[PDB]
Amino acid sequence: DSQTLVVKLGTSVLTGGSRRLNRAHIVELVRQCAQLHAAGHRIVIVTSGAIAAGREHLGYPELPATIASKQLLAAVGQSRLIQLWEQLFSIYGIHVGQMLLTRADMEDRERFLNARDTLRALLDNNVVPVINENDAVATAEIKVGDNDNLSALAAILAGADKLLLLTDQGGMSTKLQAADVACRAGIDTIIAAGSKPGVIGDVMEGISVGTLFHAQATPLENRKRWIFGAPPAGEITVDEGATAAILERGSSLLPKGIKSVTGNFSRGEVIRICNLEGRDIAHGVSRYNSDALRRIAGHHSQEIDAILGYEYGPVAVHRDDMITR
């Protein structure tokens, strides 16, 4: 009976479409979560609003149009944001815990497992995790970049049964991607209006509300779900045949099919695979250092030993360490 639900609240949900966090709207969504919590369910919050909270608290100041500006606002806003969640949940006797992360914290199976553990330890002790991107401390390069996608990753981390993406009803687009990442990991996804009375309870019960996305009948293997989180450390461009081999046959990537290789990356790191078109067709763990791949690109499997002076098997990226599409 007990279930794990991730609720994602983006900025216009939190502000009610104004330039200020709306505590009336938020406390009403907290009340709904509390009700499910009191009933034995596990609740995870993914929250936006750090920058809006900061802008408000500093009195809307003139700032250089720079990333430093946004990060300074998030440093201030995130302080205020977590307070707001803490105070509001405390009305209902519920404790919260702050987690701030980026793709960097999922560049490994190990760092992914670490984040998973923290989050499950929170839920196991009846604390609600309040998750957001670590905006104050991050380069654009390591960020998830939108909270829709982040909440899917959080759903995976939490071993969630459902993901609820609240809307204030491009914005639709990240939501569809999130629904896709989540469903493939075996998690039901619902897009629904934050302003709909009893929305969160309805979703939890199974009452048709918002837009339903069924979890994949047979989900992507648990052991490789962490690859969804990793930021690709470089990109590999690949054959017409290799492309087909990966998308149709679900096969591994042979260096025979590699056309080019961009970036510096090591064996063990996750990289992006592109077709000649330029489209991202897969992410997967590299078996070879990047200087070694440029070297064995185009050559058959039996040749690797002799080109490099060593081998780490015949495959550039193994299907078991790969996520297509």
Ligand X SMILES: N[C@@H](CCC(=O)OP(=O)(O)O)C(=O)O
Ligand Y SMILES: O=C1CC[C@@H](C(=O)O)N1
148 binds, among ligand X, Mg ion, ligand Y, none (CB under 5 to 8 A by kind): ligand X
- Centroid of chain to Cα 186: 15
Selected from 147, 189, 252, 290, the binder of ligand X by CB under 6 A is 147
**Mask 120-139, x = binds ligand Y (CB under 6 A)?**
------------xx-x----
Q: Which of these, 145, 185, 146, 148, lies nearest to 165 by C-alpha position? A: 148
Query: Distance of CA 75 to CAs 51, 55, 68, 190, 256, Å?
Result: 8, 11, 10, 31, 48
Q: Tell how strand 128-133 and strand 235-238 pair up.
A: unpaired
| CB of 270 closer than 8 Å to CB of 104 | no
Q: How far apart are CA 276 and CA 224, in angstroms?
A: 26
Q: How far apart are CA 217 and CA 45, in angstroms?
A: 26
4 binds, among ligand Y, ligand X, its own copies, none (CB under 5 to 8 A by kind): none
- 157 vs 261, which CB is nearer to ligand Y? 157
Q: Count of residues binding Mg ion (CB under 5 A)?
A: 2
Nearest to Mg ion by Cβ — which residue?
A: 10
Q: Count of residues binding ligand X (CB under 6 A)?
A: 10
Residues numbered 6-35 forming contacts with ligand X, rule: CB under 6 A: 10-11
Q: How many Å from the N-terminal Cα to the C-terminal Cα in the chain?
A: 34
- Stated as kind and residue range, the H or E segment containing 178 is helix 171-184
Interface residues with its own copies (CB under 8 A) are 57-58, 61, 63, 66-69, 71-72, 75-76, 78-80, 82-83, 86, 95-101, 104-105, 108, 110-111, 114-115, 117-118, 120-122, 125, 127, 129-130, 134, 136-139, 141-142, 264-268, 289-292, 294-295, 308-310
129 binds, among Mg ion, ligand X, ligand Y, none (CB under 5 to 8 A by kind): none
| CB of 21 closer than 8 Å to CB of 30 | no
Q: Is 78 in the site for ligand X (CB under 6 A)?
A: no
Backbone φ and ψ of 282, nearest 5°: -175, 155
Q: Which stretch binds ligand X (CB under 6 A): 32-40, 56-64, 146-154, 298-306?
A: 146-154
Residues numbered 28-57 forming contacts with ligand Y, rule: CB under 6 A: 48-52
Q: Is 239 in the site for ligand X (CB under 6 A)?
A: no
Q: Which stretch binds ligand X (CB under 6 A): 81-89, 141-149, 225-233, 259-267?
A: 141-149
**Least CB distance to its own copies at residue 215 (A):** 26
**Mask 37-76, x = binds ligand X (CB under 6 A)?**
-----------x----------------------------
Q: How many Cα atoms within 13 Å fall on the side-chain side of residue 174?
A: 17
* 114 Cβ contact list (under 8 Å, min separation 6): 105
Per DSSP, the three-state class of 261 is strand
The partner residues of 161 in beta bridges, in order of sequence, read: none
52 binds, among its own copies, ligand Y, ligand X, none (CB under 5 to 8 A by kind): ligand Y
| CB of 192 closer than 8 Å to CB of 166 | yes
Selected from 134, 147, 174, 189, the binder of ligand Y by CB under 6 A is 147
**Mask 217-256, x = binds ligand Y (CB under 6 A)?**
----------------------------------------
Q: Which stretch binds ligand X (CB under 6 A): 119-127, 138-146, 212-220, 299-307?
A: 138-146
Q: How far apart are CA 34 and CA 68, in angstroms?
A: 36
Q: How many Cα atoms within 13 Å fall on the side-chain side of residue 227?
A: 25
- Structure token pair of residue 49: 């609003």
Residues in touch with ligand Y (CB under 6 A):
11, 48-52, 132-133, 135, 147
